[PDB]
Amino acid sequence: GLPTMLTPGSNQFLTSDDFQSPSAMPQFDVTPEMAIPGQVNNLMEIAEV
Amino acid sequence: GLPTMLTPGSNQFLTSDDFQSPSAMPQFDVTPEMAIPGQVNNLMEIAEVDSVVPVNNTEGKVMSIEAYQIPVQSNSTNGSQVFGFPLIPGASSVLNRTLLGEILNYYTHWSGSIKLTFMFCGSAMATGKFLLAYSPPGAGAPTTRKEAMLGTHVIWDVGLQSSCVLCIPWISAGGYITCWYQTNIVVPADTQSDCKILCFVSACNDFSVRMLKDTPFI
Amino acid sequence: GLPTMLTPGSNQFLTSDDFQSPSAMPQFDVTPEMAIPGQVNNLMEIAEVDSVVPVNNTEGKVMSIEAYQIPVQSNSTNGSQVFGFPLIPGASSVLNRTLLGEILNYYTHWSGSIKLTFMFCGSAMATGKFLLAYSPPGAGAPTTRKEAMLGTHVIWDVGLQSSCVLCIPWISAGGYITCWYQTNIVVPADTQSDCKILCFVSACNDFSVRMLKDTPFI
Amino acid sequence: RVRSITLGNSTITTQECANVVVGYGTWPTYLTQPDVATCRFYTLESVMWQQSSPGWWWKFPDALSNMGLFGQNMQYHYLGRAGYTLHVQCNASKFHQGCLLVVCVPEAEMGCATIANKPDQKSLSNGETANVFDSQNTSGQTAVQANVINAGMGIGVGNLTIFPHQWINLRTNNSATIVMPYVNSVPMDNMFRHNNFTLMIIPFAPLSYSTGATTYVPITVTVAPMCAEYNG
Amino acid sequence: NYHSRSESTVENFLCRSACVYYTTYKNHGNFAQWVINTRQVAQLRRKLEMFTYARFDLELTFVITSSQPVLTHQIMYVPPGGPVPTKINSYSWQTSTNPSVFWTEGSAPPRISIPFISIGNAYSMFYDGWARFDKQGTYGINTLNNMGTLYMRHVNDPIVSTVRIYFKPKHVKTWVPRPPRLCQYQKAGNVNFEPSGVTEGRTEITAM
Amino acid sequence: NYHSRSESTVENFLCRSACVYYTTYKNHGNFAQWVINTRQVAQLRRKLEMFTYARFDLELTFVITSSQPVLTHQIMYVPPGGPVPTKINSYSWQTSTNPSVFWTEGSAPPRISIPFISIGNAYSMFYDGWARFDKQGTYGINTLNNMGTLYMRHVNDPIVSTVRIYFKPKHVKTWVPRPPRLCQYQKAGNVNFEPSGVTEGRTEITAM
Incomplete structure (x- = not known):
């Protein structure tokens, strides 16, 4: 295969990380989003009330 | 080599995954596909095929072909019920072993419309009327012919049509199907037996299923 | 480094795999290829070469060159069988040690056509006719010259042609080859011995094999 | 009106308006040594x-195995292939009632009455003679478990509609026509050790009649092979 | 590719992993074996038997654990027609045409792919015929459905091993739908059944 | 590339892995060795001997297990003409022109590739001649067929090791086809045979 080296940080679990992961249910057909009134995108929208 | 890091999830076997794997026999020359009639691409192609519904599945009828035969008597009280059944989706007793029922029993959730066909099998010269009524979910089954008549229904005259087709919603009380003897069956001559009605069911249109599970029938 | 995950199958040795590997001697200057006559690209190039068939492989003939010599007698009963053999693919006794047979014995499945050549080795002035008959799979070998004559056949006159070629299917009862003395062999003078026939076999056309296995001859 | 159909030296009649079912939407075609001398x-x-x-059944390659030339072509060949048109008709009056399911089932492998055993050749097929379904559980060491409700296969009989079929309701029709294509895992096969399909005729509504009427209804089955092929 | 589609499609219905075989083998006494089959598990068998013919590739994953150096295990696949071992040291374990996987504990589980391998163009779920016409014991046996055999041994020169074989059909094509089985299964080698009622019973034919 | 082709092609016929050598060595007493050869295994030998000349590269995979820290093993390849060890501590183990592989247990098996390395343009399966004309013991010895030697030792300063060597020819070219051997093999260093019958016997020359 392709030559590689493992670097420090390999096989560690960082609670702050951001990596892809496999789905346990890749074949599941997910329910579509419908509009719901009141969508919140930021907490400042609450702080400003 | 190229610097890499192993992330969480490395070296685990997920029974649901989708990764490439090496062939044990990469040099094997695989037999070409030939056309075979009857290719199935989707299970809805099976759910949409009409099958006979065991409506008369009483305790002494289940082990016989008679389970599928709804009796009709020429000397019945007018206005009495001929037959009827709950369209309960949970363990539908007359619809869960049908081609439709078997497929829906592999999913945790489903929704769509159902086609119900009723076929009269009396003699060619037999005539009379039946009232086929539909009771929407939450309405309750009717108790009399008049109550059924004031709801949603069709008058089926067997002297004009050997069969009648209803189209109802079915999702998952669940609604009901009833049939009343508006009139009795008039014949030109005595017969040695009664008349029968056969019932058929299939998925009507845009039927969908959502999450595969084990069948409860094993 | 670059985030990665190891999947099932990682760190296993599959004897059938195909991966790159490092050279133990990357700096070695390798001797260039020169043309050599006789390059073989495919084993069918060998299977298609005619080889001599040990038709007369009786118990006392197998250890001699005589195994390949079919006897012909000038005083035979007319209509009697000269020779014959099963075209059984499973352990074909007269065809499985031939160039063709050896190659086919390395595969679990094969199919194609076979060329059979019969060569007469009597004197130049010898003449007479032979009946070469073919019995399709499931037909059974013929018992008489007339039965053979009413089937599929060729009349081979050794006074016109020193050899005759048949082309038959062979896959894997398996069909049969027979040869009958339509007439005896007529000669101008007495000889001190009989006449012989040699038989040759090869793959005829579009011969294919499907799955490599160990030879059964070791 | 009435349509007269002639094949070879045989003629039958059907109603001009009769419906034809073509199994799987496929007509038989050729891929071999053809033989049309049997297309009768x-x-x-x-x-x-x-x-x-209770009902009747026939295994097809076997049902025609004694039929003159068709039977001979099976006997003189190693491999073969064929499609079939099956015509089923009832002779009944307007004073008769009842309903049949006429269905062709591919690979109708049948179960044995004794769980530990396998059914024999005659219990599975009696050639051109119809085999009969039972209303009761059958019994025997080599007997077929012919109880009707399971169609001999361990399935519910009401679900046989998945296979090519036509209903005969005597108040509307007395006939069925099914075109059955060649269906297999291989292009050609041995016609003596394999039954490509089974024809089953099963009443779902019992025969009944007025009191002065004939007490039985004849059911006739006519078979017409198509595109027959054999090894050379 | 295939997964972002309705769960009603044939590939989503059938392309799911299942544990099809559980066994054990020891380092002293000695090997495990399994003939690849589709009639081994009732849920899998029932779904496949809704079709008459099918064509698919096989994915096999092995979960291997052990109980009392690095322990190495050998998994051997014998294609239809190949030689098989009878002994822990039979010559067939070294045959070049019988692919093997050598694996050690602590690594990700072994995994191999076996392509569609029948001589015919599809595997037959049902067979209304005989391997030999005059042999009653051959009714229902289609010799074109041989998918090969797996063998497992410990590689060395009081340890007990346990093996779980996970099977998944892939790229599945099916033909000629059949009714779902009503009866419970009796044997893997047959279609024998106990006659069974078409459905559950009711006390009356009317709606209430 | 090569695999998606007929199994009748030369590369598919010959490019299959085989176990060609099985041995042992201990950490006390001390090393294993194998001279690379093609006449070691009868099935391999027979297939290669259907040709007169061949040119190929070699792939070598080592399956190593052991029985009573991390255990390290050294695999050394000595090219034709290189020095060889006689002792566990011979200087030849450190020669820069004798490539070595250092490997530890628990990792994927060691693997190396050896290119075609003869001085001639092909390896000869047969040789109708002598290395030295007047020396009868040299008949059949072609000195151009030296593929080098492998040595194995445990790296340290009552453990028993076992080694299985897996060999696979690659990128194989062959010339001048020969008849398959009829006789059983007697020795790896010869073409000696016991005279053997051309085929199996029959009771009569006729069809039945």
Whole structure:
């Protein structure tokens, strides 16, 4: 295969990380989003009330 | 080599995954596909095929072909019920072993419309009327012919049509199907037996299923 | 480094795999290829070469060159069988040690056509006719010259042609080859011995094999 | 009106308006040594439908195995292939009632009455003679578990509609026509050790009649092979 | 590719992993074996038997654990027609045409792919015929459905091993739908059944 | 590339892995060795001997297990003409022109590739001649067929090791086809045979 080296940080679990992961249910057909009134995108929208 | 890091999830076997794997026999020359009639691409192609519904599945009828035969008597009280059944989706007793029922029993959730066909099998010269009524979910089954008549229904005259087709919603009380003897069956001559009605069911249109599970029938 | 995950199958040795590997001697200057006559690209190039068939492989003939010599007698009963053999693919006794047979014995499945050549080795002035008959799979070998004559056949006159070629299917009862003395062999003078026939076999056309296995001859 | 159909030296009639079912939407075609000398109608002995009849079946390559030239072509060849048109008709009056399912089932492998055993050749097929379904559980060491409700296969009989079929309701029709394509895992096969399909005729509504009427209804099955092929 | 589609499609219905075989083998006494089959598990068998013919590739994953150096295990696949071992040291374990996987504990589980391998163009779920016409014991046996055999041994020169074989059909094509089985299964080698009622019973034919 | 082709092609016929050598060595007493050869295994030998000349590269995979820290093993390849060890501590183990592989247990098996390395343009399966004309013991010895030697030792300063060597020819070219051997093999260093019958016997020359 392709030559590689493992670097420090390999096989560690960082609670702050951001990596892809496999789905346990890749074949599941997910329910579509419908509009719901009141969508919140930021907490400042609450702080400003 | 190229610097890499192993992330969480490395070296685990997920029974649901989708990764490439090496062939044990990469040099094997695989037999070409030939056309075979009857290719199935989707299970809805099976759910949409009409099958006979065991409506008369009483305790002494289940082990016989008679389970599928709804009796009709020429000397019945007018206005009495001929037959009827709950369209309960949970363990539908007359619809869960049908081609439709078997497929829906592999999913945790489903929704769509159902086609119900009723076929009269009396003699060619037999005539009379039946009232086929539909009771929407939450309405309750009717108790009399008049109550059924004031709801949603069709008058089926067997002297004009050997069969009648209803189209109802079915999702998952669940609604009901009833049939009343508006009139009795008039014949030109005595017969040695009664008349029968056969019932058929299939998925009507845009039927969908959502999450595969084990069948409860094993 | 670059985030990665190891999947099932990682760190296993599959004897059938195909991966790159490092050279133990990357700096070695390798001797260039020169043309050599006789390059073989495919084993069918060998299977298609005619080889001599040990038709007369009786118990006392197998250890001699005589195994390949079919006897012909000038005083035979007319209509009697000269020779014959099963075209059984499973352990074909007269065809499985031939160039063709050896190659086919390395595969679990094969199919194609076979060329059979019969060569007469009597004197130049010898003449007479032979009946070469073919019995399709499931037909059974013929018992008489007339039965053979009413089937599929060729009349081979050794006074016109020193050899005759048949082309038959062979896959894997398996069909049969027979040869009958339509007439005896007529000669101008007495000889001190009989006449012989040699038989040759090869793959005829579009011969294919499907799955490599160990030879059964070791 | 009435349509007269001639194949070879045999002629049958059907209603001009009769419906034809083509199994799987496929017509038989050629891929071999063709033989059209057998492309004639073969009419099987009629069976009588009574008030209590449980049903009948035929294995096809076997049903025609004694039929003259068709039977001979099976006997003189190693491999072969064929499609079939099956015509099923009832002779009944307007004073008769009842309903049949006429269905062709591919690979109808049947179960044995004794769980530990396998059914024999005659219990599975009696050639051109119809085999009969039972209303009761059958019994025997090599007997087929012919109880009607499971169609001999361990399935519910009401679900046989998944296979090519036509209903015969005597108040509307007395006939069915099914075109059955060649269906297999291989292009050609041995026709003596494998039954490509089974024809089953099963009443779902019992025969009944007025009191002065004939007490039985004849059911006639006519078979017409198409595109027959054999090894050279 | 295939997964972002309705769960009603044939590939989503059938392309799911299942544990099809559980066994054990020891380092002293000695090997495990399994003939690849589709009639081994009732849920899998029932779904496949809704079709008459099918064509698919096989994915096999092995979960291997052990109980009392690095322990190495050998998994051997014998294609239809190949030689098989009878002994822990039979010559067939070294045959070049019988692919093997050598694996050690602590690594990700072994995994191999076996392509569609029948001589015919599809595997037959049902067979209304005989391997030999005059042999009653051959009714229902289609010799074109041989998918090969797996063998497992410990590689060395009081340890007990346990093996779980996970099977998944892939790229599945099916033909000629059949009714779902009503009866419970009796044997893997047959279609024998106990006659069974078409459905559950009711006390009356009317709606209430 | 090569695999998606007929199994009748030369590369598919010959490019299959085989176990060609099985041995042992201990950490006390001390090393294993194998001279690379093609006449070691009868099935391999027979297939290669259907040709007169061949040119190929070699792939070598080592399956190593052991029985009573991390255990390290050294695999050394000595090219034709290189020095060889006689002792566990011979200087030849450190020669820069004798490539070595250092490997530890628990990792994927060691693997190396050896290119075609003869001085001639092909390896000869047969040789109708002598290395030295007047020396009868040299008949059949072609000195151009030296593929080098492998040595194995445990790296340290009552453990028993076992080694299985897996060999696979690659990128194989062959010339001048020969008849398959009829006789059974007697020795790896010869073409000696016991005279053997051309085929199996029959009771009569006729069809039945």
